[PDB]
Design a protein around this ligand. Structure first.
Ligand SMILES: O=c1[nH]cnc2c1ncn2[C@@H]1O[C@H](CO)[C@@H](O)[C@H]1O
Ligand SMILES: O=c1[nH]cnc2c1ncn2[C@@H]1O[C@H](CO)[C@@H](O)[C@H]1O
Ligand SMILES: [Zn+2]
Ligand SMILES: [Zn+2]
Lengths: 157, 157
């Protein structure tokens, strides 16, 4: 089931690049096997630098569930969440994060070297507690392929 | 100039908890002497845990200026930005941050012990070149006192 939702997040990444909405990033928030939110980066569409895929998915899942905390839900990020998004994931109380590509894969195509210490275990003032799974095998493969397949098909931001 | 906009952010914090919009946090984004956006925490009003004061101000300023970068602008935060908000400030290319109260004054009244490594300079991966000013003197004291003045006039989140 992990692979299914991670694949849907990668699909959102491609969808958003095709739409012109933003960069090649997707995020799916699930209440067990029920998709509560399926989003991609909306920075260009919304004129909003905070509208990353994960932040957008959190906003939509909270509206869907009519609550400000998502302790029952898990988040699948096509890319390793950035400091802002991992902060949002912390605040939302999501109980588990599954991400596909290491941040270096997105950084390699020109996004900022902007990595969340608290996610990688080098946080000091930010203490993460949620379950974190970095994808391997085919999940890592598709997530990393996103950035080679979408190269030069979107404006960087 | 710093003191005027910091105190405006504090006034936003008070107005927001009075309205029931969210917690006692305000944020003001300025282009030299011109205020671009003036906001407070909207987490309760929006059912959105990402709607901190700083994020809300960033969203509104970007929409007002029709651009996703704020490199001519500075942000005034009544409280030390959290990891989410500091990440959002980094992504928005804001050129300077001034904040009033240290995070500990908010933690004192029950908010999460949730502090941005990159702001305090404690990270391995995330490092910030943003110019950061912690307020001193009168502005600092006014900002720190908001939490004891607003103790239980709002719902915690
Ligand atoms: O919607 C997004 N989701 C995840 N990362 C993003 C997004 N947009 C831009 N980046 C950028 O990709 C790099 C790797 O984390 C970071 O620079 C991050 O800000
Ligand atoms: O709108 C807000 N702005 C800044 N911090 C906030 C806001 N809402 C809640 N907190 C919380 O206050 C503590 C100290 O910074 C942190 O736990 C942060 O998440
Ligand atoms: Zn992000
Ligand atoms: Zn914040």
């Amino acid at each position: 089931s992990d692979h299914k939702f991670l694949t849907q997040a990668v699909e959102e990444a491609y969808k958003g690049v095709d739409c012109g909405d933003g960069g090649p990033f997707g995020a799916v928030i699930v209440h067990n096997n029920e998709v509560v939110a399926s989003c991609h980066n909306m920075v260009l569409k919304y004129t909003d630098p905070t509208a990353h895929a994960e932040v957008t998915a959190i906003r939509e899942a909270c509206k869907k569930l009519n609550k400000i905390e998502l302790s029952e839900c898990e988040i699948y990020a096509s890319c390793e969440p950035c400091p802002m998004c991992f902060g949002a994931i912390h605040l939302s109380r999501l109980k588990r994060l599954v991400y596909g590509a290491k941040a270096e894969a997105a950084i390699a195509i020109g996004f900022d070297d902007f990595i969340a210490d608290a996610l990688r275990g080098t946080g000091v003032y930010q203490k993460s507690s949620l379950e974190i799974k970095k994808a391997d095998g085919n999940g890592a493969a598709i997530a990393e392929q996103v950035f080679q397949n979408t190269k030069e098909k979107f404006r960087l931001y």
